[PDB]
C-alpha cells in the first residue's frame, strides 16, 4: 500500500492536531477539454449576472470548511475551554490512487482496473491560477468521514463586458504548470506553514462598550443639561451639570462602536413583513462597474437588538441550510440562520441607525435639527468584533492582491491570508475515472482561558430531552446531519 | 503580619492546586471548662436519641466541604474536562493571630488589644482523639471568601447505658496533648500527605450494564423458552431458543448490577403521597444494640426510574438547603434535593426491588412461586458506582479502625482514608476572644478525557437566562447564595 | 481609606438608583475595596473608632492588618479611563479619600443576562500590611508614540444666549450613537476644530447640578484646526445626481465622513486636568487606538491597585452560630502613598 489511514485529534498543551482521511472519486470533466462559458447559453437575462470565463477539465481539493477538521465533539471541547485558536502547520498526503476505465455495451457497463493509467496532480504555491477557495463554494470534504464525495470541477471567471470579453481578459492553461503524475503505486505529499494570523476571538464580552464606567463615582467632566429656564419668550440660557451615574447616557467615553451599513429588517413571522416583493428592491447592495451586486453578508454587525429574535437582517447573515434542503424556493424553516448578536456590545445593530448628526445651525428662528446616520464608516477610536466562525463555515480566504486594504479579515469570517493554503489541482489522464484517498493535517495553536470569574460560564451542550435521533449523527437511513450552526463565542472576557 | 493572603487556584497538567484563605473569630466556650453532656439535660426523650459526651472549651477547623477549595467556575472547569480527581497534598496555615479584650463599662462596651495573650493550637497526627470531621457537620469555612466565620466548639461522645455512663466509657482532656502557643507575632502551619486513594469517577456511562451486547449477532447460548406446547393436560415440554438481539432480556451476561437496600418512595407532588405519617415509621434503618439508626443516605443506588422525576428516596439522597433556610420544618421548596440519575446504568433503583428469586421446587402439583428481593448484599460479579460528590459535599471520612471492612469508600461520598487530614484544635488561653486568618491548600491529581465520542457531550452550563440577579453571586443586600447542587458526573465513558 | 459597604459585595443596578430611563439603565456590582512606573505604600496606620455615648474616640490599633494586591493580568474590570474623581489631588499638601471600586456589567434593562460576570477580589492572593510593612512594585511602559480628517457633525450652541434657540434642545439636538438601542451622547467625539464634543472642567468649588457657564472651564480644540475639520460645519459637498440637457446639477452636504486613504489628522490636546492613559478594549480590531479623551491608549496599561481594611469582627457570641458575622469594629486606615513616573521627552 502507498499510505495508511489516519483520522484522529491529539490534544497537547496549547496545540491541536487535526487529522482527517477521506476517500474521493474523480470523473472526467469537459470530455478532456477547455470550454468557454458565458451567461448567454444559460440565458444571461441580467446585467448584474453577466459573466465570461472558462471551465477546465481538472478537479481540485478543498478542505476550507471547519467541519472537515473537527469532529463535533472536538469542536465543543475547543469552544468551551479556549479563548482563541489559529492554524500553524499543514500536512497533506495523496495516496492509494486508482483509475477505473468504463466500457458499456448496450445496457450494462463493466468497470475494470486499469493499472497503467496515470493521475496528474499538482499544487500551485505561487498562486498563478485564479484562486476560488475563498468564495465558500461546495465540493469540500464531507463532514462525516465514511461519506465518499465527488471532487469539484475547477473553473474561473475573467473580465467581461456583458457576455463579451475584453483585450485584458486572461486564459490560464492548467496543463502549463509542471505536475507530478501518479500511478497506483505513487503517493503525493506536501507540507505547508501558515503565515502569522491573529487568534480568532472566541468569547463574548461581559461588559458593553458604553458601560465601561465606574457606577459609583461622578466624572469631573461637565455636560449641557438645559437650554431654557421655562415657558415663555427669551428663555435662552446655558446650564451645565456633572456627568454621573444618574445620567450615564452623557458620560465622556474613550471608545465608540464600530462601522455600520444598514440592512433592511425581515421578520421570521411572515405576517409582520410588508405585503410586497421587497426581497431584491429593499435589500442593501453595492455597485461595481455598472453591475449592481448585493451586500452580503456585509460588515460584521449584531443581528438584532437585545430581546428581538424574530428579526434578521435581510442580506446580512450567514444562512446555512439543513441536510436535505432543496436547491430553490425552500421554506424558511428548511434553512439555518446564524446570528452575530454576541458582538452587540461593541458593534451596532445591523437593522438600526448608527446614530444621529445635526443638520443645521440653530438660531432664534431655527430649531436644532438632526438626521439619521444610515451608514458610518471607520472613525478613529472605534473598536469592533469580527464575524464569528462556525463549525459549518469557511476557515480562510485569500486577501486580494491590491494596493491596500483595511482589516484584511474576510467579511464572511475566518482567517484572511495573503498566501493561504495553495490550490491542489487533479485530473484523470487524457471513458475512465479515478478514486483515491486524502489525508490532510493542520496544527492549531490555542489560547488558554485565564478568567478569574466567580460564577459559571455558558457552555455549549447537547440538550437533555429524549429524541428520535442523536444529534450530529446518522439517521436510520444512514444520512449524517448537522442539526444547527455552532459558532464559537461562549466563554467571556471583560471589555 | 506573619503571613499573606492566598486564594486563587492554578491548573497545571494533571494537577490542580487550589488555595482558600479565611478570616476567623474564636469565642470562649463553656466558660473555659469541660462539661459532661448527656441527653437528660436536653431530655433525651427516646432511647435512639440517648448519648454521653463531653463539651470542651476547644475549637477546631473543618474544611472538609468542597466549595471551600473551589469556586463555582473552577468547579465547572473540573467537571467538564475531567474523568477523575483525588487529593494528594494538603497545606494548612494559621497566622495573624490577634487577641482582643472586651471592656464592658455600663451597658456600652469598648474592646482593646491584649498583647501578652496567647492562642494554643494542636493537631493530632497519632489519632488518639475521637475524630469528628466525618459527620459532615456545620461550621466549615464559608464558600464565599469575603465572609468571616466563627470557629465551632469541639466535643465528642462515647459509650452509654441509657443516658448514664458505663465502666468502659472514656474521658479525654485535650489539655494533655502538647500544643503550640502564639502571640500577635506568631504563625502556625503544617503540611500533610493524603494516603493513596482511587480516583473519584466524574463521568456517566455511555452504556447500561444490561445492554453491553452486540445488537447484530446471536449468542451461542440457549435459554429455556417454551415449557408448554399449548393448552391442555399433561402438556409439559422443554423448548430452547437462541439468545439474540430480538429478545435481549433473556441473554446471558458476565456482570450484574450493584447491591441494594430498599428505601421508601416519596413524591414531590404532595397529593400523591399517603395521608399518613411515614417519615420515621416508613424509613429503612439499621438497629445497633437496641438503638435504631435512620439509613442515610444509604448504599449507592439510583434515585428514581426512567421518566419519573417527581419521586425521590425518602432517605436515599443528600438534601441541602437554600440560603436563608430555617433550621426546623422548612418548606419543600426551600431545600435542594440531589439525585443519582447518572448511576442508573450499573446501580439498582433505590425505591425498587433488586430482582426476584424462586422460593420453592416446582413439581406436577406445585406452581412456581417467586418473591421479591428487597435487599441484596454483595455477590461475586457485581459492579456498582459510588455516590457522586457535590460542590457542597464532604470530601473525606476516616475509616473506623476495625478488623474488617468492604469498600471503605464512605456512604455520603468522597474518599475514605485511615489517616485523613488530622484534626486541628484551637482555644483561647485562659472576657477574651481572638481572631486571625486561615489559608488551607489542597492538591488534586486529575484524570483526563481519552474518549473518541463523535457527537458533542453534556456540559454543566449556565443558562442564557436574564433575571433579577446573577447566579452564584451576591444579591443587593450582600447575601451570597448558591442556587443549585452541582454533581461531578457529566462526561461519558463506555461501560 | 474608609470602610465601604460594611465588608460586603453588593449588587447595584438602575432601579437601585431609582432608574426610570432606558438609555440610562445599568447593572453591576460594588465592592468593599478601594483603588517606568514605580509605586510604594508605606507607614500604614489603623485608626479604630469607638463611640461612648456621642463622643468619638480614635485609637491606635497596632495589631490590625491592611490588604493590597495589584492586578497585572487585567483579570478585573478596569474603570481608570473614565475620568473619575478620587485621583491624587492637584495640591501636594491635600489629604484625599480613597475611592470605592465597583464595576458595571451586561444588562437588559435592570436585569442581568446569563453572560454577566461577578468577580470576587478576595480570590486573588494579596499582601497583608501591618504598620511596619511596606508594599512596592514597578511597572514598565510598552512602546507608545510621543504625544504631539473625518467628521461627525456637532450641533452649534452659543455662549451668548440671545443667539441661542428659544426651545429646549439640550438632548433633542445632539449627535448620538445608538448601541443595542440605547441612545448614547457622542462625547468628546473625534478630534475636530461642539455641543457634546468639548472637554469641560469645573472651577474650584463648583456645584454638582445646574451650574451656569461661569462655573466651568469649557476647553476648545482650535489649535489642531489647521489639519482638522470644523465641528459645526459639514465636511464638504457631493453630487446628488447626473446633469443632462434636462437636468441641472445638484449638490448635497456631507455631515459625516469616515476614513479615506490618505487622511491626516491631529489627536485631542491633553491638559494637566485631564487623563493620562486608557485601556484598549480587547477586541478583534480597532482603528487609531488613541483614546478620544486624549493621552496614551495601551493594551497593558498600568495595573490596578486594590486595597481595603481587613475586617476585624466585634465580640462573637459564646455558642456557635453558622451565620456569618455582621458586627464589626468601626475602623479606617491611612498611610503614605508615593507614585513615581519616569518620562521621555
Amino acid at each position: 500500500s502507498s499510505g495508511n489511514w489516519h483520522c484522529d485529534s491529539q490534544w497537547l498543551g496549547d496545540r491541536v492536531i487535526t487529522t482527517s482521511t477521506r476517500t474521493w472519486a474523480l470523473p472526467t470533466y469537459n470530455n478532456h477539454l477547455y470550454k468557454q462559458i458565458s451567461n448567454s447559453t444559460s440565458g444571461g437575462s441580467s446585467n448584474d449576472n453577466a459573466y465570461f470565463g472558462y471551465s477546465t477539465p481538472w478537479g481540485y481539493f478543498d478542505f476550507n470548511r471547519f467541519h472537515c477538521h473537527f469532529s463535533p465533539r472536538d469542536w465543543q471541547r475547543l469552544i468551551n475551554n479556549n479563548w482563541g485558536f489559529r492554524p500553524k502547520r499543514l500536512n497533506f498526503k495523496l495516496f492509494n490512487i486508482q483509475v477505473k476505465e468504463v466500457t458499456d455495451n448496450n445496457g450494462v457497463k463493466t468497470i475494470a482496473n486499469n493499472l497503467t493509467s496515470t493521475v496528474q496532480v499538482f499544487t500551485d504555491s505561487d498562486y498563478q491560477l485564479p484562486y476560488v477557495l475563498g468564495s465558500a463554494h461546495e465540493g469540500c470534504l464531507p463532514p462525516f468521514p465514511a461519506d465518499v464525495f465527488m471532487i469539484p470541477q475547477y473553473g474561473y471567471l475573467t473580465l467581461n463586458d456583458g457576455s463579451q470579453a475584453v483585450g485584458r481578459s486572461s486564459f490560464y492553461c492548467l496543463e502549463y504548470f509542471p505536475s507530478q503524475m501518479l500511478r497506483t503505486g505513487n503517493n503525493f505529499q506536501f507540507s505547508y506553514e501558515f503565515e502569522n494570523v491573529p487568534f480568532h476571538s472566541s468569547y463574548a464580552h461581559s461588559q458593553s462598550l458604553d458601560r465601561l464606567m465606574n457606577p459609583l463615582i461622578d466624572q469631573y467632566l461637565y455636560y449641557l443639561s438645559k437650554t431654557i429656564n421655562g415657558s415663555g419668550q427669551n428663555q435662552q440660557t446655558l446650564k451645565f451639570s456633572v456627568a454621573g451615574p444618574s445620567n450615564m447616557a452623557v458620560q465622556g467615553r474613550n471608545y465608540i462602536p464600530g462601522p455600520s451599513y444598514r440592512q433592511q429588517r425581515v421578520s421570521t413571522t411572515v405576517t409582520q413583513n410588508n405585503n410586497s416583493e421587497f426581497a431584491w428592491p429593499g435589500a442593501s447592495s453595492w455597485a461595481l462597474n455598472g453591475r449592481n451586486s448585493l451586500m452580503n453578508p456585509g460588515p460584521a454587525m449584531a443581528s438584532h437588538k437585545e430581546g428581538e429574535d424574530r428579526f434578521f437582517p435581510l442580506s446580512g447573515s450567514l444562512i446555512f441550510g439543513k441536510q436535505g434542503t432543496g436547491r430553490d424556493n425552500v421554506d424558511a424553516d428548511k434553512v439555518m440562520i446564524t446570528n452575530e448578536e454576541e458582538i452587540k456590545t461593541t458593534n451596532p445593530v445591523a437593522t438600526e441607525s448608527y446614530g444621529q448628526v445635526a443638520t443645521n445651525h440653530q438660531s432664534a428662528q431655527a430649531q436644532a435639527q438632526t438626521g439619521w446616520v444610515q451608514n458610518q464608516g471607520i472613525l478613529p477610536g472605534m473598536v469592533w468584533q469580527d464575524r464569528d466562525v462556525y463549525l459549518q463555515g469557511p476557515i480562510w480566504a485569500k486577501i486580494p492582491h491590491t494596493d491596500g486594504n483595511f482589516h484584511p479579515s474576510p467579511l464572511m469570517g475566518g482567517f484572511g491570508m495573503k498566501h493561504p493554503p495553495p490550490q491542489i489541482l487533479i485530473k484523470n489522464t487524457p471513458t475512465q475515472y479515478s478514486t483515491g484517498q486524502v489525508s490532510v493535517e493542520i496544527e492549531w495553536e490555542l489560547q488558554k482561558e485565564n478568567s478569574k470569574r466567580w460564577n459559571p460560564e455558558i457552555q455549549y451542550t447537547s440538550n437533555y430531552y429524549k429524541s428520535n435521533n442523536v444529534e450530529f449523527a446518522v439517521n436510520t437511513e444512514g444520512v449524517y446531519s448537522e442539526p444547527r450552526p455552532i459558532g464559537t463565542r461562549y466563554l467571556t472576557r471583560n471589555l | 503580619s506573619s503571613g499573606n493572603w492566598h486564594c486563587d487556584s492554578q491548573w497545571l497538567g494533571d494537577r490542580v492546586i487550589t488555595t482558600s484563605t479565611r478570616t476567623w473569630a474564636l469565642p470562649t466556650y463553656n466558660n473555659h471548662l469541660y462539661k459532661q453532656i448527656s441527653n437528660s439535660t436536653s431530655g433525651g426523650s427516646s432511647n435512639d436519641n440517648a448519648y454521653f459526651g463531653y463539651s470542651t472549651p476547644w475549637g477546631y477547623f473543618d474544611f472538609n466541604r468542597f466549595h471551600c477549595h473551589f469556586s463555582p467556575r473552577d468547579w465547572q472547569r473540573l467537571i467538564n474536562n475531567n474523568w477523575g480527581f483525588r487529593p494528594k497534598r494538603l497545606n494548612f496555615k494559621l497566622f495573624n493571630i490577634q487577641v482582643k479584650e472586651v471592656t464592658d463599662n455600663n451597658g456600652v462596651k469598648t474592646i482593646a488589644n491584649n498583647l501578652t495573650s496567647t492562642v494554643q493550637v494542636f493537631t493530632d497526627s497519632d489519632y488518639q482523639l475521637p475524630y469528628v470531621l466525618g459527620s459532615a457537620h456545620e461550621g466549615c469555612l464559608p464558600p464565599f471568601p469575603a465572609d468571616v466565620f466563627m470557629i465551632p466548639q469541639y466535643g465528642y461522645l462515647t459509650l452509654n447505658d441509657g443516658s448514664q455512663a458505663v465502666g468502659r466509657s472514656s474521658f479525654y482532656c485535650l489539655e494533655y496533648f502538647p500544643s503550640q502557643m502564639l502571640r500577635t507575632g506568631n504563625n502556625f502551619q503544617f503540611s500533610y500527605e493524603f494516603e493513596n486513594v482511587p480516583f473519584h469517577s466524574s463521568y456517566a456511562h455511555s452504556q447500561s450494564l444490561d445492554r453491553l451486547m452486540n445488537p447484530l449477532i446471536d449468542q451461542y447460548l440457549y435459554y429455556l423458552s417454551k415449557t408448554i406446547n399449548g393448552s391442555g393436560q399433561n402438556q409439559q415440554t422443554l423448548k430452547f431458543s437462541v439468545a439474540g438481539p430480538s429478545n435481549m432480556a433473556v441473554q446471558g451476561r458476565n456482570y450484574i448490577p450493584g447491591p441494594s437496600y430498599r428505601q421508601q418512595r416519596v413524591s414531590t407532588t404532595v397529593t400523591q403521597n399517603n395521608n399518613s405519617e411515614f417519615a420515621w415509621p416508613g424509613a429503612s434503618s439499621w438497629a445497633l444494640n437496641g438503638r435504631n439508626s435512620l439509613m442515610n443516605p444509604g448504599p449507592a443506588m439510583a434515585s428514581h426510574k426512567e421518566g419519573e422525576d417527581r419521586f425521590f428516596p425518602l432517605s436515599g439522597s443528600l438534601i441541602f438547603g437554600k440560603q436563608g433556610t430555617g433550621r426546623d420544618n422548612v418548606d419543600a421548596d426551600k431545600v435542594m434535593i440531589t439525585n443519582e440519575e447518572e448511576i442508573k446504568t450499573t446501580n439498582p433503583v433505590a425505591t425498587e426491588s433488586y430482582g426476584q428469586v424462586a422460593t420453592n421446587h416446582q413439581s406436577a402439583q406445585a406452581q412456581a412461586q417467586t418473591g421479591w428481593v428487597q435487599n441484596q448484599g454483595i455477590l461475586p460479579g457485581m459492579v456498582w458506582q459510588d455516590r457522586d460528590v457535590y460542590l457542597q459535599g464532604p470530601i473525606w471520612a476516616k475509616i473506623p479502625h476495625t478488623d474488617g471492612n468492604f469498600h471503605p469508600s464512605p456512604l455520603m461520598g468522597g474518599f475514605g482514608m485511615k489517616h485523613p487530614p488530622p484534626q486541628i484544635l484551637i482555644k483561647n488561653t485562659p472576657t477574651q476572644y481572638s481572631t486571625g486568618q486561615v489559608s488551607v491548600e489542597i492538591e488534586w491529581e486529575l484524570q483526563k478525557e481519552n474518549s473518541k465520542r463523535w457527537n458533542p457531550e453534556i456540559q454543566y452550563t449556565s443558562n442564557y437566562y436574564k433575571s433579577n440577579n446573577v447566579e452564584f453571586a451576591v444579591n443587593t443586600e450582600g447575601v451570597y447564595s448558591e442556587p443549585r447542587p452541582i454533581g461531578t458526573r457529566y462526561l461519558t465513558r463506555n461501560l | 481609606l474608609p470602610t465601604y459597604n460594611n465588608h460586603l459585595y453588593k449588587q447595584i443596578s438602575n432601579s437601585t438608583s431609582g432608574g426610570s430611563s432606558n438609555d440610562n439603565a445599568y447593572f453591576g456590582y460594588s465592592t468593599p475595596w478601594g483603588y517606568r512606573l514605580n509605586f510604594k505604600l508605606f507607614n500604614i496606620q489603623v485608626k479604630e473608632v469607638t463611640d461612648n455615648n456621642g463622643v468619638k474616640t480614635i485609637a491606635n490599633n497596632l495589631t490590625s492588618t491592611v490588604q493590597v494586591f495589584t492586578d497585572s493580568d487585567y483579570q478585573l474590570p478596569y474603570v481608570l479611563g473614565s475620568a473619575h474623581e478620587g485621583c491624587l489631588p492637584p495640591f501636594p499638601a491635600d489629604v484625599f479619600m480613597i475611592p470605592q471600586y465597583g464595576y458595571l456589567t451586561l444588562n437588559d434593562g435592570s436585569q442581568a443576562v446569563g453572560r454577566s460576570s461577578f468577580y470576587c477580589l478576595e480570590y486573588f492572593p494579596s499582601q497583608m500590611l501591618r504598620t511596619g510593612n511596606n508594599f512596592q512594585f514597578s511597572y514598565e511602559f510598552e512602546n507608545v508614540p510621543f504625544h504631539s480628517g473625518p467628521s461627525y457633525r456637532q450641533q452649534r450652541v452659543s455662549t451668548t444666549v440671545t443667539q441661542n434657540n428659544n426651545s429646549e434642545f439640550a438632548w433633542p439636538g445632539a449627535s448620538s450613537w445608538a448601541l443595542n438601542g440605547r441612545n448614547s451622547l457622542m462625547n468628546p467625539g473625534p478630534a475636530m476644530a461642539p455641543l457634546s464634543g468639548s472637554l469641560i472642567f469645573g472651577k474650584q468649588g463648583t456645584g454638582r447640578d445646574n451650574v451656569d457657564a461661569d462655573k466651568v472651564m469649557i476647553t476648545n480644540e482650535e489649535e489642531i484646526k489647521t489639519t482638522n475639520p470644523v465641528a459645526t460645519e459639514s465636511y464638504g459637498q457631493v453630487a446628488t445626481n447626473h446633469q443632462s440637457a434636462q437636468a441641472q446639477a445638484q449638490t448635497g452636504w456631507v455631515q459625516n465622513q469616515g476614513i479615506l486613504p490618505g487622511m491626516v489628522w491631529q489627536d485631542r490636546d491633553v491638559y494637566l486636568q485631564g487623563p493620562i492613559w486608557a485601556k484598549i478594549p480587547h477586541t478583534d480590531g480597532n482603528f487609531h487606538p488613541s483614546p478620544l479623551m486624549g493621552g496614551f491608549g495601551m493594551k497593558h496599561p498600568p495595573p490596578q491597585i486594590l486595597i481595603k481594611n481587613t475586617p476585624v469582627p466585634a465580640d462573637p457570641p459564646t455558642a456557635f452560630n453558622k451565620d456569618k458575622l455582621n458586627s464589626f469594629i468601626t475602623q479606617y486606615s491611612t498611610g503614605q502613598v508615593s507614585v513615581e513616573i519616569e518620562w521621555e521627552l
Partner: antibody, heavy 126, light 108 residues
C-alpha cells in the same frame, strides 16, 4: 419546584371588566414567553394570547383581539391579562402557561408549553 | 382549527393512536405540533413537543408521529393512569397557536 399560580378573578357582569394576574416562582421568568389559554367548561383548550420575554411581540388570537391586553413585569415575576367588554363567549378556566425554552443562544425555538398554571375560573354571567 | 376525534377507547395492555388533522399552514407545512394529556380539573401536562421529541418527566409509553397533513400520538401498554383527555397543539403560519377539540381516552 417550578410554580405558576394565578390569582385572577371570579364572577363578573357582562360588558364589565376583569384583571387576571399570575406569579412565576422557581424559574427565571424574564427569559420565557408566557401564554394565556382558556378552557370553556365543556370544550377544549383555546389560546387567547402570548407575550414575549422582552415584551416586543404580543399577539392575540382573533376572538378577543382588541378587547384584552397582556403585560408582564419581569422584576416582579408577574404576568397580567386585563380584559374589557366581556361577553358570555368568554367564560373559562384561564391558564398561565409558558413555552419550551432550553437556555441557549438566540434563534433557537421550541414548540410546546412546558409548565402550566393550576388555573382560575372566570364566570361572566348576566 | 385542528380536527381530532371526540373520543377513543382501548383495552389495557394494547397500544392505541389518536390523530389530529390540520391545514397545510398549521401542520402540513410547518413542523410544530405538540401533545398534552389532561385530567379533569388539573392543568394540562406536556407529553410530546415538536413531533417526536419528548420532555424528561414524561413516560416512555408516549410517542409521536407526523404522517403529513396529520399528527398522531401513539400510547403503548395502556393502564388505568392513562385515562385522560389528549390535546393537539400546533403553532400556525402566522405564529399564533391553535388547539383541537380534545379527545377523551377511556380504558375499558
Amino acid at each position: 419546584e417550578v410554580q405558576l399560580v394565578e390569582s385572577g378573578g371570579g364572577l363578573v357582569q357582562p360588558g364589565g371588566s376583569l384583571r387576571l394576574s399570575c406569579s412565576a416562582s422557581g424559574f427565571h421568568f424574564s427569559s420565557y414567553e408566557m401564554n394565556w389559554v382558556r378552557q370553556a367548561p365543556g370544550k377544549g383548550l383555546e389560546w387567547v394570547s402570548y407575550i414575549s420575554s422582552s415584551g416586543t411581540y404580543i399577539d392575540y388570537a382573533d376572538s378577543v383581539k382588541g378587547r384584552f391586553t397582556i403585560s408582564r413585569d419581569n422584576p416582579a415575576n408577574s404576568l397580567y391579562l386585563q380584559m374589557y367588554s366581556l361577553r358570555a363567549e368568554d367564560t373559562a378556566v384561564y391558564y398561565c402557561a409558558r413555552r419550551l425554552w432550553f437556555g441557549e443562544l438566540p434563534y433557537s425555538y421550541y414548540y410546546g408549553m412546558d409548565v402550566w398554571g393550576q388555573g382560575t375560573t372566570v364566570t361572566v354571567s348576566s | 382549527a385542528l380536527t381530532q376525534p371526540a373520543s377513543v377507547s382501548g383495552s389495557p395492555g394494547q397500544s392505541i393512536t389518536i390523530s389530529c388533522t390540520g391545514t397545510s399552514s398549521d401542520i402540513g407545512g410547518y413542523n410544530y405540533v405538540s401533545w398534552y394529556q389532561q385530567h379533569p380539573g388539573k392543568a394540562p401536562e406536556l407529553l410530546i413537543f415538536d413531533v417526536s421529541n419528548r420532555p424528561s418527566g414524561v413516560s416512555n409509553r408516549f410517542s409521536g408521529s407526523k404522517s403529513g397533513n396529520t399528527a398522531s400520538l401513539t400510547i403503548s401498554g395502556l393502564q388505568a393512569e392513562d385515562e385522560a383527555d389528549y390535546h393537539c397543539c400546533s403553532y400556525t403560519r402566522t405564529s399564533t397557536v391553535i388547539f383541537g377539540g380534545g379527545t377523551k381516552l377511556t380504558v375499558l
